[PDB]
A paper describes a structure:
When activated, CaM binds to and stimulates the activities of a family of Ca2+/CaM-dependent serine/threonine protein kinases (CaMKs), thereby regulating their functions. However, the regulation mechanism of CaMKI remains elusive. Here we report four crystal structures of three truncation variants of human CaMKIα, namely CaMKI320 (residues 1–320), CaMKI315 (residues 1–315), and CaMKI293 (residues 1–293), which correspond to the aforementioned three truncation forms of CaMKI, respectively. The catalytic core of CaMKI takes a canonical bilobate architecture, with the N-terminal lobe (N lobe) consisting of five antiparallel β-strands and a prominent helix named helix αC and the C-terminal lobe (C lobe) comprised primarily of α-helices.
CaMKI315 containing the autoinhibition segment cannot be activated by CaM as the CaM-binding segment is incomplete. The CaMKI315-ATP structure is very similar to the CaMKI320-ATP structure and also adopts an inactive conformation. The bound ATP shows evident electron density and maintains similar interactions with the enzyme as in the CaMKI320-ATP complex; however, the phosphate groups of ATP have a much higher average B factor and no Mg2+ was observed in the electron density. In addition, in the CaMKI320-ATP and CaMKI315-ATP structures which are crystallized in another space group (P63), two pseudo two-fold symmetry-related molecules are juxtaposed head to tail in a similar way as in the apo CaMKI320. However, helix αT is largely disordered in one molecule and completely disordered in the other, although the hydrophobic cluster at the interface is partially maintained. Although the CaMKI320-ATP and CaMKI315-ATP complexes show substantial differences from the apo CaMKI320 in the activation segment and the nucleotide-binding site, in all three structures helix αR1 (residues 287–297) of the autoinhibitory segment interlocks with helices αD and αF, and the surrounding structure elements including the αD-αE loop and helix αE adopt essentially identical conformations. Superposition of these structures with Akt/PKB-GSK3β shows that the residues at the P(-5) and P(-6) positions of the substrate peptide would collide with the C-terminal part of helix αR1, suggesting that helix αR1 might exert the inhibitory function via occlusion of part of the substrate-binding site. ATP binding can induce conformational changes at the nucleotide-binding site and the activation segment, leading to the formation of an inactive, pre-CaM binding state which is represented by the CaMKI320-ATP and CaMKI315-ATP structures (pre-CaM binding state). In this state, the activation segment is largely disordered and its restraint on helix αC is alleviated. Nevertheless, helix αC remains in an inactive conformation and the catalytic site is only partially assembled.
Author numbering: 10 to 54, 65 to 163, 181 to 299
The structure:
């Protein structure tokens, strides 16, 4: 937790890697070591001690913090593989089993955070980055929305780590069909959809998806936080731990739905 006079004495700021709600992420070179990093530039408009304890293969490591008069600079492990949806769209062949492998990694990382007492609360397909352009690259959670936001939260009821399990279910849903489980033109009706947790595995998009996958999703996307699968429980579900995920090429439809619905 140092301070920088000119942050630029220490980092060479090159290109914007991406942009958040009210912060940008920048590719930089550590001038001291020549190591490439990703720097999160947060305007100034106890948890950082915890953020350094986070060390997991599927979580973007925070490597340092420096502060200037105007901003906070979070020096992050650089990830070079691009966003999750982009790879899926650009990918030639895509299966339920690829979806399951990604979900496994997210569950693994999320449970590890829950054991540190960290609740993500903003798990989104955007937060999910490939580690390299390697075809076999692992995925990683970058961060430390309607749709993705669990019913409890939107009901302004008491919420636990179970909120993150909801988000994971929403992501799994999108990963298998390319569109969000909740959508309406009127925000009011959308929120009511989310609050009632009423969604469908609607045909034709879901015809070729396994029942085990549907079972898996039903259990994460469960309105009652006390009924909802936890990370540990989702990990041991057959679709994740066994051999139920199918091998059919679902790329075309999912890819087209993603283009219709995101970026
Ligand atoms: N470590 C990283 N390496 C490479 N690119 C990153 C890294 N972290 C973030 N990015 C890029 O920045 C984008 C924005 O992510 P974040 O900055 O994670 O968005 P956010 O969830 O809106 O956070 P915030 O609300 O604090 O701005 C990502 O989608 C990705 O393209």
């Amino acid at each position: 937790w140092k301070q920088a006079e000119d942050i630029r004495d220490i980092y060479d700021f090159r290109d914007v890697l991406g942009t958040g709600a009210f912060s940008e992420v920048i590719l930089a070179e550590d001038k001291r070591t020549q190591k490439l990093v990703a720097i999160k530039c947060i305007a100034k408009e106890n948890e950082i001690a915890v953020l350094h304890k986070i060390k997991h293969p599927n979580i973007v490591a925070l490597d340092d913090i420096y502060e200037s008069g105007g901003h906070l600079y979070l020096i992050m492990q650089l990830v070079s593989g691009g966003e999750l949806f982009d790879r899926i769209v650009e990918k030639g062949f895509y299966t339920e089993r690829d979806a399951s492998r990604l979900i496994f990694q997210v569950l693994d990382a999320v449970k590890y955070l829950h054991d540190l007492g960290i609740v993500h609360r903003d798990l989104k397909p955007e937060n999910l980055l490939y580690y390299s352009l390697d075809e076999d690259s692992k995925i990683m959670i970058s961060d430390f929305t309607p749709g993705y936001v669990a019913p409890e939260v939107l009901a302004q009821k008491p919420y636990s780590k179970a909120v993150d399990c909801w988000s994971i279910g929403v992501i799994a849903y999108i990963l298998l069909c390319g569109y969000p489980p909740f959508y309406d033109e009127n925000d009011a009706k959308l929120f009511e959809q989310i609050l009632k947790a009423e969604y469908e595995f609607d045909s034709p998009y879901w015809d070729d998806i396994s029942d085990s996958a549907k079972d898996f999703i039903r259990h994460l996307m469960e309105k009652d936080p006390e009924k909802r699968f936890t990370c540990e429980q989702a990990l041991q579900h057959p679709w994740i731990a066994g051999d139920t995920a199918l091998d059919k090429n679902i790329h075309q439809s999912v890819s087209e739905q993603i283009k219709k619905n995101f970026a």
